User: Fold Agglutinin-like protein 5 from Candida albicans.
Amino acid sequence: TSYVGV
Amino acid sequence: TSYVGV
Amino acid sequence: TSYVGV
Amino acid sequence: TSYVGV
Amino acid sequence: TSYVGV
Amino acid sequence: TSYVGV
Amino acid sequence: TSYVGV
Amino acid sequence: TSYVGV
Amino acid sequence: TSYVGV
Amino acid sequence: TSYVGV
Amino acid sequence: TSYVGV
Amino acid sequence: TSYVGV
Amino acid sequence: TSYVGV
Amino acid sequence: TSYVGV
Amino acid sequence: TSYVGV
Amino acid sequence: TSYVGV
Amino acid sequence: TSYVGV
Amino acid sequence: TSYVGV
Amino acid sequence: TSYVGV
Amino acid sequence: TSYVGV
Amino acid sequence: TSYVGV
Amino acid sequence: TSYVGV
Amino acid sequence: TSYVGV
Amino acid sequence: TSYVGV
Amino acid sequence: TSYVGV
Amino acid sequence: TSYVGV
Amino acid sequence: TSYVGV
Amino acid sequence: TSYVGV
Amino acid sequence: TSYVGV
Amino acid sequence: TSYVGV
Amino acid sequence: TSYVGV
Amino acid sequence: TSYVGV
Amino acid sequence: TSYVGV
Amino acid sequence: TSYVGV
Amino acid sequence: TSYVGV
Amino acid sequence: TSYVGV
Assistant:
């Protein structure tokens, strides 16, 4: 899964 | 803002 | 599932 | 605002 | 189910 | 306002 | 069921 | 106002 | 059943 | 005003 | 049954 | 059902 | 049933 | 004025 | 004014 | 269902 | 004004 | 569902 | 203004 | 889903 | 403004 | 997915 | 501004 | 911002 | 994926 | 998986 | 500005 | 910024 | 992958 | 795997 | 500016 | 900047 | 791979 | 594997 | 400026 | 800068 700003 | 699975 | 700002 | 499954 | 602002 | 299942 | 503002 | 099942 | 303002 | 089942 | 303002 | 100003 | 101003 | 089901 | 289902 | 100003 | 499903 | 200003 | 799914 | 200004 | 998936 | 200004 | 996948 | 799997 | 200004 | 800024 | 994969 | 697997 | 200014 | 700035 | 793989 | 496997 | 200014 | 600036 | 593999 | 296997 993609994670941005985590 | 955080974005997961987008 | 997608999660934004969580 | 948070958005889940949208 | 979708959840916004919860 | 919160929105669930909309 | 949908829930708004609950 | 709250709205459920509408 | 629908519920508004309850 | 509250509205149920309308 | 419908209920308004109860 | 439609709801306006409720 | 329709409801106006209730 | 409020309008429901109109 | 709020509008739901219109 | 559509929701405006809720 | 907020608009959902419009 | 679309969400504007929520 | 925020726009989701538009 | 697209997200603008979230 | 941020733009995701546009 | 594309991300601009995130 | 940052640009990813554009 | 951090980006994972994008 | 391309990344500009990240 | 790709990792940027982690 | 930095450019990766462009 | 660090880049792994890009 | 190409990297400029990284 | 490639590693830049790690 | 640095250029790699260009 | 360090570059490994690029 | 080519490297300029690294 | 290639190593630059390590 | 340094040039490698150009 | 050091270069190994380039």
In short: The longest strand of chain M covers residues 3-4. Chain M has no helices and one strand. Chains M and AH do not touch (no CB pair under 8 Å).
